[PDB]
Amino acid sequence: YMETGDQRFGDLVFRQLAPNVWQHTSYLDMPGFGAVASNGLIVRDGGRVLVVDTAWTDDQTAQILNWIKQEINLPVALAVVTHAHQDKMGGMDALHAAGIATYANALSNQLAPQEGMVAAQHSLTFAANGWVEPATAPNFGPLKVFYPGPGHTSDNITVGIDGTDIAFGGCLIKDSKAKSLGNLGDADTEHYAASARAFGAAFPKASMIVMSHSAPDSRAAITHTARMADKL
């Protein structure tokens, strides 16, 4: 397949990362930071779609689904949400209104309501090696869900996509050229370096790491993240 150009649809941008995979990107102006990109994933598996997180708001999340209707036109079977923050969870209401089953780390679930956000309907749990208990993850298809341990946040979870060299660190992995690890308030600084490495180990073949706030990087984002994290 030939590279097609990145599609502007409403306030959203969609970059195709593979034949079955797209990155959705949405923006919100934060008080001093200007307009802040947030990335997510859309994944076409056979005759159904899977979504990785939401946009900043219920309204942009609705735009995402309209985009899926127009450009793909297959039912969205479910969404997985990688940690609790307005950028990942702020569109839960939109998903619930559309009838879509939502999953999050059991911990993201306990946390969201306090954050003033809507929880996912379903709670994922993980084995000691960090792969999801398959009982709690019905038919996730190509989606491979992994909990590295307490990270940047205690709830961060991550995912790769079978069939591809793609893997999504979310809030955990930072740009290879990053000057800081950013906000450590919910971070576990003892385990942060370990978490970055477990993630890399979990997805050893992944050549494309999709970042929460920036353009997908190579594995260098991981090693760079782990090292910065060893300063703590």
Residue numbers in the entry: 38 to 269
Task: Give the exact sentences the study uses for this entry.
Three of our apoNDM-1 structures are zinc-free and are the first structures of a wild-type apo-enzyme in subclass B1. In our three apo and one monozinc structures, there are nine independent representations of NDM-1 molecules with different crystallization conditions and packing environments. In these structures, most active site loops show very small conformational changes with the exception of ASL1 and to some extent ASL4. ASL1 shows the ability of assuming several alternative conformations that may be important for binding ligands. The structure of zinc-free NDM-1, along with the previously reported structures, provides important insight into the conformational changes associated with the metal binding properties of NDM-1.
NDM-1 has been reported to be a highly potent carbapenem-hydrolyzing, zinc-dependent MBL. Our results show that NDM-1 is unique among other MBLs due to its enlarged and flexible active site, and explain the observed extended spectrum β-lactamase activity.
